[PDB]
From a paper:
Picobirnaviruses (PBV) are small, non-enveloped dsRNA viruses infecting a wide range of mammalian and avian species. Human PBV (hPBV) has been identified on almost every continent, and has been associated with acute gastroenteritis primarily in children and people that are immunocompromised. It has a bi-segmented genome with the genome segment two (PBV2) encoding the viral RdRP and the genome segment one (PBV1) encoding the CP and a protein of unknown function. The hPBV RdRP possesses a canonical polymerase fold with a 24 amino acids (aa) long C-terminal insertion loop structure that partially occupies the active site of the polymerase. The polymerase domain, which is structurally highly conserved amongst RNA viruses, has a right-hand configuration with three subdomains: the fingers (aa 85–230, 268–324), palm (aa 231–267, 325–414), and thumb (aa 415–470).
To determine the exact biological function of the insertion loop structure, a hPBV RdRP lacking the loop structure (i.e. ΔLOOP) was synthesized and expressed. Gel filtration chromatography showed that ΔLOOP was eluted at a similar position as the WT protein. The ΔLOOP RdRP was crystallized and its structure solved by molecular replacement using the WT RdRP structure as the phasing model. The overall structure of ΔLOOP appears to be essentially the same as the WT RdRP (root-mean-square deviation in distance = 0.4 Å for 3275 common atoms), except for the deleted insertion loop which became unstructured in the ΔLOOP RdRP. Given this structural information, we are confident that the removal of the insertion loop should not affect the overall folding of the polymerase, and that the ΔLOOP RdRP should provide an excellent tool to study the function of the insertion loop structure using in vitro assays. However, while the WT RdRP utilizes a de novo initiation mechanism for RNA synthesis, the ΔLOOP could only initiate RNA replication through back-priming, suggesting that the insertion loop serves as a platform for initiation. Due to the heat denaturation, the dsRNA products generated by the WT RdRP were converted to ssRNA, while the dsRNA products of the ΔLOOP RdRP retained the same mobility as the original dsRNA. This result indicates that back-priming was taking place during dsRNA synthesis by the ΔLOOP RdRP, thus producing a product that was covalently linked to the ssRNA template. Additionally, it was noted that the removal of the insertion loop significantly increased the TNTase activity of the RdRP. Given our TNTase activity data and the fact that the insertion loop is located near the C-terminus of the hPBV RdRP, we propose that the removal of the insertion loop structure leaves the dsRNA exit channel of the protein permanently open, thus allowing the 3’-end of the RNA molecules to reach the active site for nucleotidyl addition in an orientation that is compatible for nucleotide addition.
Numbering used by the authors: 1 to 492, 520 to 534
Write the structure that this text describes.
Amino acid sequence: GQVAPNVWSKYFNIPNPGLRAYFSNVVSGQPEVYRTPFYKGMSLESICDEWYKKLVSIDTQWPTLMEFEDDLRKKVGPMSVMLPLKERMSDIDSYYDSISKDQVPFDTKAISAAKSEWKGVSRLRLRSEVNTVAVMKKSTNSGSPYFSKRKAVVSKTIPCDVYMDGRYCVMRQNGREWSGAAVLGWRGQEGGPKPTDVKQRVVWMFPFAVNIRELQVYQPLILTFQRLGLVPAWVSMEAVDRRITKMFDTKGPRDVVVCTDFSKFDQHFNPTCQSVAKELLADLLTGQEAVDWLERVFPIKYAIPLAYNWGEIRYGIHGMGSGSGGTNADETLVHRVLQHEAAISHHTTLNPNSQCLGDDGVLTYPGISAEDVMQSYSRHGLDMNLEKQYVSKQDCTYLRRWHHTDYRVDGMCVGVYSTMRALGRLAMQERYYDPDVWGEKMVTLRYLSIIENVKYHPLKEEFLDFCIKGDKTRLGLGIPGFLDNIAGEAQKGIENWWVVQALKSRR
């Protein structure tokens, strides 16, 4: 994969000490387990064991909630252990090798069914690069070529034009021509109590110029879908819960709900899947600028080179570059086609209160079974382990929340987040920040964002009292002014969070 130094400098603005440090850390990895101050002096097991003594009280009335909690308890553990590059090469290979599995075309009727859900919608037009940049996150890394904060390089980036030229990504940026490459990034996810259990997620950190061009379509798309409520997970967890409720209200009395799961969905998002995304987008879009975007920009996330070490670049087509501006959009649109196709393949109609988001789905239709869904999806070159599908007539899991037809608050099947998963995240963090340089307010803000997830758990009040006891600052109760100025401290919808209201009530 190695390129000459004066070829590397056509992909990145050189010199760049920050980029140099970055790839050194990629090569070395980060072996330390980062433990927060939460219940300092106690192990993760002891924290979990102590809370479990009280959690277990729900097993009699909500035994499937206990099963859900027990399941996620097995994943509790470190999140910070990042393996060296030498031990992640298979993770990279997967993106290139997984798209060539046997893959059959999609049913044309299912594609029509998906399009029909947005009949009459205002067709999308590209936003301008300037307007798009204005609403983007500009704290994030600009990727190739400057590898700085976006905010710092806007004037050097736009106007921009990006396109594939054979295996190369050409990026014209305000008078410069660069060669584009994603940068290999990393995220850790808990997968068990040992340091070797940490899930090694690959992140494709895209060039700012590519993300701008992509978001000229995906930004207005997501906004339109949000306002129409077509993808509830893009709106809120309360919108998700409302649709879960309707799914239970309108499902076949004899039918199960199926909660699906994909192995390495991004990696398997092959050219057959890509062409379906392109067809749906072409339906949604209007204008000549859109025609050009579909031919020039849309394919980049499936073909952009990958810079995985200093001076090392990999080329060729691959699955979804996890990190594209359309990562979630392309996948969610195509996932909805998959759901329609499963129903249509069994001579019926998808219950439209079924839902999907990226690789996560929950659905029902007359006579549905998990193995039928698995067969209907997998024939397109997608990987699924039947053992990880979940089936029930009375409950479901979606976006790591449990719902039950008999567990309703003001008539909604609200989503219950695992307190066990919450405890693991309170105790373990993905990245180290020195609190001498960064402060304890940010620790507390992280705690609150985790705890807020359990706002519908039957034991949330006991859980909060348990968490308060683990925090020196008592979740901000011990930080003068903090709770009263929490939106502000957050900047330096949180004021409306349940956990904030619950803490203030304990004053």
